[PDB]
Design a protein around this ligand. Structure first.
Ligand SMILES: *[C@@H]1O[C@H](CO)[C@@H](O[C@@H]2O[C@H](CO)[C@@H](O)[C@H](O)[C@H]2NC(C)=O)[C@H](O)[C@H]1NC(C)=O
Ligand SMILES: *[C@@H]1O[C@H](CO)[C@@H](O[C@@H]2O[C@H](CO)[C@@H](O)[C@H](O)[C@H]2NC(C)=O)[C@H](O)[C@H]1NC(C)=O
Ligand SMILES: *[C@@H]1O[C@H](CO)[C@@H](O[C@@H]2O[C@H](CO)[C@@H](O)[C@H](O)[C@H]2NC(C)=O)[C@H](O)[C@H]1NC(C)=O
Ligand SMILES: *[C@@H]1O[C@H](CO)[C@@H](O)[C@H](O)[C@H]1NC(C)=O
Ligand SMILES: *[C@@H]1O[C@H](CO)[C@@H](O)[C@H](O)[C@H]1NC(C)=O
Ligand SMILES: *[C@@H]1O[C@H](CO)[C@@H](O)[C@H](O)[C@H]1NC(C)=O
Ligand SMILES: *[C@@H]1O[C@H](CO)[C@@H](O)[C@H](O)[C@H]1NC(C)=O
Ligand SMILES: *[C@@H]1O[C@H](CO)[C@@H](O)[C@H](O)[C@H]1NC(C)=O
Ligand SMILES: *[C@@H]1O[C@H](CO)[C@@H](O)[C@H](O)[C@H]1NC(C)=O
Ligand SMILES: *[C@@H]1O[C@H](CO)[C@@H](O)[C@H](O)[C@H]1NC(C)=O
Ligand SMILES: *[C@@H]1O[C@H](CO)[C@@H](O)[C@H](O)[C@H]1NC(C)=O
Ligand SMILES: *[C@@H]1O[C@H](CO)[C@@H](O)[C@H](O)[C@H]1NC(C)=O
Lengths: 461, 461, 461
């Protein structure tokens, strides 16, 4: 079933190699695009496809965390002198071992004195004492990772085809890997070692995930990286993720719970007689009602194809680019001849909608029909075909044979509200063949839990 | 009044287009600079000017905020048992409705017990009770915006001029827009559709505003974006902007005021008899005496021409680059001929000063007189002309006709303290024409409010 | 002892300069790599070496800070009414002047009432009073600096050599400086002013230190910049560096100590009779046992050669790149001839190990023996020579004469655990000369202080 990719139309620059005090070469220069192919014959058709663009972020920090289910049970003591409900019993301490109660649960005590005598005597100033309880919700487990400045790699696919009696035959097929952060990188591509591929980047990739805190879910086991305010290992913000952390054993606890609990737990007596109180947690990312989970970066970020922790060693994360800038190629050899070939660009029809998504992304959700090669778009002013061009684009369909593909076209802010015409034309197609349609514009836009003790009072009068 | 821009001197690379199993083209390649023009004739003079470079950041978060005017009124109760000044009346509660008092005001209550008996009896431990009041200052309103990784666009200006009887005539004039983050983008430029402009970026722009929190003022209505420590929607740091937020109705409130007020308001009794107390707010960005407003990015950042929220929909912000890297151009056609033209570079005189600004920017505040084209500078070691060159620069004046322009020249750290010579020479000018001057070096460098209640005590003994 | 650098093998593109209504030039185009040289003769051998790549970050914020040695002495008062240990004496106040005690010490008082009567009477509720003391540890002093978006400069070395009777003679030798963030920069290189060097960057450097907070040690005096969670001037997080700040005089104090001390100091009575208590600081970066110092960026970050505050004025920091992308060069002249030369690439042997360091860096710690020029590596699948290639690299040794050098080779994540073969071959060397070795894989991975007062109680009953 062996078949070459669509050979793109690329201008070629003939450069001449410098010389030493010896025996007069030449280099063939061109700019290859990501997710496109280049074809040539040596005077067996040679093809190179810039398949993948990846960033390899080192993982500097790591820590497992979860989402806690919080429950607070209190008790009031009317007499400020009483032995029950005290600083030594409640202030900065975990409620001692119940022996039967769950191993997964994690509790912390807080001391609330200087109360108002409601359902009490006018002179005696009450005191409140609470057990803040935390257990994992739905057994949700995530790894938190600190991704720092990456190394960039390009992945090329070298294939050599032959036309033997009516059909194509993939003779040789390799994967070429080249580091893009330094100078030129050079290697032979064919088995015959006659030809050399030289890859050079202009500067940094058009895109790169920002150095920061990331995470993904764990299935008792890595998954698609997400981004939501998360705490660096050394930080403990209660409004950001990771204050409920998993230790070695698999036991979850509130990071410096003992000490911090009194700054994040706030309770006031409603009536000491009925044993009623107002309670809250001055935090986020807890259950109930304080936790929603952000979708993977892949989903929300069009430039991202995938963003995942590479393996079980948890040392690097790989960001696979969906959109990237071209790379500079030079093909060199002794002294022979090189000719570059290119298939034609075609298009039957297209469909799509202009959308501003919930994450503020302005794109044209384009779908091409029976298409191949380089396809040129022109976004128009009004609904009228022939109105003024406001943006001009070029999409590249990688299929040798005309097929139906779906793609995302980033648009400038000039492509504002209201429906408008868009005109697609393949490469070197007469303006009679140019398909036009009126495209639609869509746009997506962007506490106290009062309880009566329940457990009853053991110390009434 | 139709006139072409200064046609820059640019080397042109002749590349040959690849071929298919059909009918032997050619492509003209060159690197266009931002704020410069390129001229050519087809064998009507064709001109292309790289006019604008813009980043289009999606706005992920949004919230209106203000600056609060804070006022705290207190009262002391000598007897720790008293019904006046209590946890239920003061701890975690907004002072109930006054019915006459301002709608714009926002108040919060705090409870300060366990006091020292100053102007009281040696055994009874006092208690203090305060109403922290907040109202907008000068009706100042700002939108807070979260700018994330942008899409880059180039804006070109295509104009075709003709010389009809002594004067130039702008025949055709278009605006070309090309996305710079992906592969090559291609479109026709002339009405005749004979010529095609192909734009390719090397990698990311030399500059890009960092993903973070930004804001600008609102005039009851967007303005020039500023940068000052500001809170992300989900965060509530009191030392950073946006803790005083505007809801739907236009009412400003302290974000989670009720709960947090006791962590940020700190008061101690001075004398319970005279009703004197020491008061403070453990926050920033409040009035009086705790608020200065950072100038727009445009002002402080030389690389920024403008940074503004694009429109009323508040979905994207546009950063217009003042300084940027060159773009790769290729002009292609059937088979005809292309010749590139360039006007000469001139300079009468210059003036300027070497400055290190308050924001640590080392630049040469250059002013050119009766100048056009490419102008070459050479910064010298000492005040002596002919001393060793320490930096070499090239500025490009876009005016066809010699005019007076002012510009910013970024300098390395080697261009240290003390006055020195700088020598300017236009392109291809003999070293006799080279203007020299000794340039001057300038350098810019980088709580408790105690009150006696006033309202008097209603509860004396 | 004058000697040229290894002249690299570089393809040269012949471009033709545009023309005006006057007298037909030409430009020689090539991509120079960082830490490599280019050689040519004009028809005295001319050499240009891209020596240095630097980022010049402006320093927007500055503040000296230290590391504090913390000591807390307390005292308990059993009777809640007592004149000793009070809100006025302890809450939000510095312990008044001792007159003899150290000038370097900085103390703060905290008030802990509503205690439990341990070693006391069942009805009287105690109170605790502490003096938190802070002094510099080991007289450690550091400057905190805010580095913002930099300006990029390239530093070239132009040298012209002559071969006079058996040996080379360095005739002319200059340092060329070119700004990389804008358009093309142009200057003459030779004393004869015949030749012009034109430098153009594709986009941003492959690497750039992130805008943020940095610091380095001071020797009573700048040093190698480090990175560790540090507070921006306006922020006061106790879990991050710089809360212990040095004022003008050289006196260190806790940033807003008075006010914050009660939020970060937490103490509970153990027994009021014996005068025993549990004490802690809810902070980081303090002594004892809460401070380790991060190594310089140079050490941890392979892409960084050096990162240092430039000088005594403390206005800019210079980041010297160890790894960077190529720059675009064009050499132009009247009308004459240019020929480019290149020495050969050689290699005797090599040694090294594949390492994943503590900071998650995957690299090949390569050491070359009797080597010069362009050296090509091929990382193999298994230990077997001849197994499948998984990565391909190219290193450039700058020595004209074959010497022994050590280098860092960034590797993709595909180069996983276990030993494997790596094959090095110089440029244009037959596959017989290719040295192979099996290389080893190494991998580095990533509270309450209870005291009895000691000072004794002055107020027993
Ligand atoms: C795509 O382009 C290639 C390369 O130009 C074409 O390949 C030729 O295939 C035929 C049979 O169709 C042979 O007889 C030729 O010798 C091939 N050329 C070379 C240079 O090896 C190809 O057919 C085109 N395909 C489509 C689907 O448009
Ligand atoms: C700038 O350069 C242009 C293009 O080389 C010059 O344009 C010519 O204008 C004259 C009249 O002055 C005509 O007779 C020519 O045919 C034009 N050339 C082309 C190629 O169309 C121009 O005059 C120069 N201007 C300045 C102010 O220096
Ligand atoms: C490196 O390359 C240079 C340049 O090609 C060689 O330089 C020549 O030196 C010899 C003496 O050895 C002279 O007679 C030539 O005229 C030089 N050439 C030029 C163009 O000026 C050089 O010897 C080579 N060196 C090594 C160590 O390999
Ligand atoms: C998860 O809790 C579940 C129920 O939600 C239980 O089946 C299981 O033993 C727990 N284990 C882990 C490893 O999360
Ligand atoms: C986007 O494009 C694909 C392909 O046509 C389709 O599944 C989907 O409906 C589109 N979504 C929107 C919102 O246009
Ligand atoms: C493309 O979709 C259309 C129907 O909308 C049809 O012309 C065609 O069969 C589809 N698939 C391919 C591979 O051409
Ligand atoms: C602003 O307060 C002013 C006085 O500063 C008053 O004229 C006005 O009604 C207020 N309105 C808004 C919308 O800010
Ligand atoms: C900078 O340049 C302009 C133009 O000459 C002028 O308005 C201004 O005085 C200059 N400022 C300084 C500080 O040199
Ligand atoms: C430039 O300024 C000078 C005076 O400093 C003068 O030569 C000239 O008239 C000015 N303007 C133009 C457009 O040349
Ligand atoms: C540093 O403390 C030392 C001992 O560690 C003492 O010799 C000296 O006077 C102090 N001075 C400064 C400037 O740090
Ligand atoms: C890295 O390379 C150098 C040079 O051979 C050597 O000093 C050192 O042992 C190496 N370290 C490791 C861990 O391989
Ligand atoms: C390189 O090291 C080896 C020994 O490991 C030896 O061949 C040689 O003398 C050394 N130095 C140079 C400059 O060649």
């Amino acid at each position: 079933r062996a078949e070459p990719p669509h050979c793109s139309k690329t201008p070629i620059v003939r450069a001449q190699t410098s010389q030493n005090a010896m025996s007069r070469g030449m280099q063939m220069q061109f700019s290859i695009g990501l997710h496109t192919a280049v074809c040539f014959r040596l005077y067996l058709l040679h093809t190179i496809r810039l398949e993948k663009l990846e960033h390899h972020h080192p993982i500097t920090q790591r820590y497992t965390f979860g989402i806690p289910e919080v429950h607070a049970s209190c008790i009031c003591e009317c007499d400020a002198t009483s032995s029950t409900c005290t600083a030594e019993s409640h202030q900065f301490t975990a409620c001692p071992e119940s022996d039967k109660s769950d191993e997964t649960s994690s509790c912390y005590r807080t001391f609330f004195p200087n109360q108002t005598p409601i359902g009490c005597s006018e002179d005696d100033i009450p005191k409140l004492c609470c057990d803040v309880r935390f257990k994992p919700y739905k057994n949700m487990t995530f790894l938190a990772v600190k991704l720092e400045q990456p190394t960039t790699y390009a992945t090329f696919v070298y294939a050599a085809y032959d036309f033997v009696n009516g059909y194509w035959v993939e003779k040789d097929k390799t994967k070429i890997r080249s580091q893009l952060d330094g100078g030129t990188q050079d290697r032979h591509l064919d088995q015959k070692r006659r030809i050399s591929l030289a890859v050079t980047a202009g500067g940094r990739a058009s895109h790169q995930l920002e150095t920061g805190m990331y995470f993904s879910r764990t299935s008792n086991e890595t998954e698609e990286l997400r981004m939501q305010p998360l705490n660096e290992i050394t930080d403990n913000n209660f409004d950001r993720l990771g204050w409920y952390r998993m230790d070695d054993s698999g036991h979850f606890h509130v990071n410096n719970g003992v000490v911090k609990m009194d700054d994040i737990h706030k309770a006031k007596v409603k009536n000491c007689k009925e044993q009623t109180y107002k309670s809250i947690l001055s935090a986020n990312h807890y259950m109930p009602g304080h936790f929603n989970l952000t979708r993977p970066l892949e989903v929300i970020k069009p430039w991202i194809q995938s963003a995942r922790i590479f393996d079980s060693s948890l040392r690097q994360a790989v960001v696979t680019h969906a959109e990237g800038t071209n790379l500079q190629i030079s093909i060199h050899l002794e002294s022979q001849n090189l000719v570059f070939f290119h298939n034609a660009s075609r298009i039957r029809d297209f469909s799509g909608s202009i959308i501003v998504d919930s994450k503020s992304n302005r794109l044209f959700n384009l779908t091409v029909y029976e298409a191949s090669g380089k396809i040129d778009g022109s976004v128009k002013m009004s609904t009228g075909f022939g109105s003024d061009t406001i943006h001009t684009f070029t999409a590249y369909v990688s299929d040798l044979h005309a097929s139906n593909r779906s793609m995302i076209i980033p648009l400038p802010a000039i492509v504002g509200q209201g429906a408008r015409a868009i005109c697609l034309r393949a490469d070197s197609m007469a303006d009679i063949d140019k398909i036009c349609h009126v495209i639609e514009y869509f746009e997506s836009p962007l506490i106290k839990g009062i309880s009566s003790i329940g457990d009853g009072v053991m110390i009434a009068t």
